[PDB]
Design a protein around this ligand. Structure first.
Ligand SMILES: COc1ccccc1Nc1cc2cnn(-c3cc(C(=O)NC4COC4)sc3C)c2cc1F
Length: 346
């Protein structure tokens, strides 16, 4: 008689509204377990993510409340839009789980990275990534943690971002990915909008190379791979570092740094025709303006949107959606539960 029913996807239990049918697992998609389903009311397929007791600790709760708030705060075709938010529980007292429903896409960006892509679809994905990031920046949201696993793609090239990024101690055997974070994040520097441009460059370079550009067990190894390939930054960059990090970075073995022709040889790009020959040099040129250690010498979102490799997709109304209440501090489990429950019920 109630509007909910229970199914077992994996070893997880999905209690969802009776409008969603034929639940099957898909991918990881951060912060829990996600399902594909058919929505009988909308006559379309959807993705449903379960947030199991998001108020169980500060890290889970601060992020969950931040997501739930910020999603009815953005409106752009390359940023996640929720079709529905619900909890099967009736009261605050019994409140346990939150379910997020969104349009069903087809694949991670990780899977697309493994593929061998043409310039037309490559640049269109980066175009959509830059538009979504521009929208977030214009809404006063600087991500700082873009990664392929949090960007979903459709078969027709459409792309959406999922997570809104950073704002700590976890208990599970689930590890965070850090390879796409900017030197500002690795070195605790204070940042600006183009901190997300470094992440786009890491993604674009991985699409070309089919290898993580800057892998490592932690920031120690990750930093070595940055300076090994890009070289030690100029004395101006390091002047802007805090004394302690300053000493560790000044004393790291100096590296000359390879040029971008040798970092991404023409072998990695299609270049059997004249069109592909030109697009390869354009693609490599943008990479060299994005994979810059010093954020003062790093290209901005707006400048990269006007890059010849990118601007072939520009259209009058395509990022023209201005933002249509704020973060909190230290709360307890009881307080985060009530805060999250209110946002769910409105
Ligand atoms: C904050 O994140 C979320 C918030 C709310 C709800 C969900 C999410 N996350 C989430 C959303 C999507 C949207 N599409 N997919 C997806 C579908 C795949 C697939 O195999 N589809 C078959 C081919 O057509 C059936 S693969 C893949 C990555 C997702 C995976 C997700 F984890």
């Amino acid at each position: 008689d109630n509007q909910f029913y229970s199914v077992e996807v994996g070893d997880s239990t999905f209690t969802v509204l009776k409008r969603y049918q034929n639940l099957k697992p898909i991918g990881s998609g951060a912060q829990g377990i996600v399902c594909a389903a058919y929505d009988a009311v909308l006559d379309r397929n959807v993705a449903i993510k379960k947030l199991s007791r998001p108020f169980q600790n500060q890290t889970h709760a601060k992020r969950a409340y931040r997501e739930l708030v910020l999603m009815k705060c953005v409106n752009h075709k390359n940023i996640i839009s929720l079709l529905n938010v619900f909890t099967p529980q009736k009261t605050l007292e019994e409140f346990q789980d939150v379910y997020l429903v969104m349009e069903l896409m087809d694949a991670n960006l990780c899977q697309v990275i493994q593929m061998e892509l043409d310039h037309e679809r490559m640049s269109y994905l980066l175009y959509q990534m830059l538009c979504g990031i521009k929208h977030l920046h214009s809404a006063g949201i600087i991500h700082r943690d873009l990664k392929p696993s949090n960007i979903v793609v459709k078969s027709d090239c459409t792309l959406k971002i999922l997570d809104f990024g950073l704002a700590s101690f976890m208990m599970t055997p689930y590890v965070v990915t850090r390879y796409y974070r900017a030197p500002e994040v690795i070195l605790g520097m204070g940042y600006k909008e183009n901190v997300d441009i470094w992440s786009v460059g890491c993604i674009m370079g991985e699409m070309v190379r089919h290898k993580i550009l800057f892998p490592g067990r932690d920031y120690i190894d990750q930093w070595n791979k940055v300076i090994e390939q890009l070289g030690t930054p100029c004395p101006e960059f390091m002047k802007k570092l805090q004394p302690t990090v300053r000493n560790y970075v000044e004393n790291r073995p100096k590296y000359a740094g390879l040029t971008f022709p040798k970092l991404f040889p023409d072998s990695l790009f299609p270049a059997d025709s004249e069109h592909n020959k030109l697009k390869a040099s354009q693609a490599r040129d943008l990479l060299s303006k994005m994979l810059v250690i010093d954020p003062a010498k790093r290209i901005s979102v707006d400048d990269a949107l006007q890059h010849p490799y990118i601007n072939v997709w520009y259209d009058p109304a395509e990022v023209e959606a201005p933002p249509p209440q704020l973060d909190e501090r230290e709360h307890t489990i009881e307080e985060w539960k009530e805060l999250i429950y209110k946002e769910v019920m409105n």
